[PDB]
């Protein structure tokens, strides 16, 4: 991004950790997300 | 050249406004300043 | 015409077909005014 002017919400979620390998292989894991917006409030869901 | 600010996604209060503050004039229009607690606003600005 | 008074303030609301005549300076919580009319002291009577 270039910059930001006027941010009405900011945010950091819960801590967690990631592997960050530089190798090659089959996808050992899976990630799912359902982004949605209902009645003016954003929401997200997930599973590993 | 007053300063316009944004109060968003937090909880305000009134009881922390006068205990030793002793300001010049505290008043509110269309609602008693005493019951700021029960009332529930949206997208509060701050100009000073 | 300054003979017409309307109540500036009251502790609570009124009742169907109710009248109040007596008068005290509005006082909030502690530090009772006793006619001082300083911070947190306000005059109940109002003039047109």
Curated annotation (Swiss-Prot), chain A:
Residue positions the entry lists as glycosylated: 6
Residues of the full protein shown: 160 to 207 of 1273
Recorded consequence of changing residue 31 to S: In strain: Gamma/P.1
Protein name listed in UniProt: Spike protein S1
Function: Attaches the virion to the cell membrane by interacting with host receptor, initiating the infection. The major receptor is host ACE2. When S2/S2' has been cleaved, binding to the receptor triggers direct fusion at the cell membrane. When S2/S2' has not been cleaved, binding to the receptor results in internalization of the virus by endocytosis using host TFRC and GRM2 and leading to fusion of the virion membrane with the host endosomal membrane. Alternatively, may use NRP1/NRP2 and integrin as entry receptors.
Segments for region (Disordered): 14-26
Subunit text: Binds to host ACE2. RBD also interacts with the N-linked glycan on 'Asn-90' of ACE2. Cleavage of S generates a polybasic C-terminal sequence on S1 that binds to host Neuropilin-1 (NRP1) and Neuropilin-2 (NRP2) receptors. Interacts with host integrin alpha-5/beta-1 (ITGA5:ITGB1) and with ACE2 in complex with integrin alpha-5/beta-1 (ITGA5:ITGB1). May interact via cytoplasmic c-terminus with M protein. May interact (via N-terminus) with host bilirubin and biliverdin, thereby preventing antibody binding to the SARS-CoV-2 spike NTD via an allosteric mechanism.
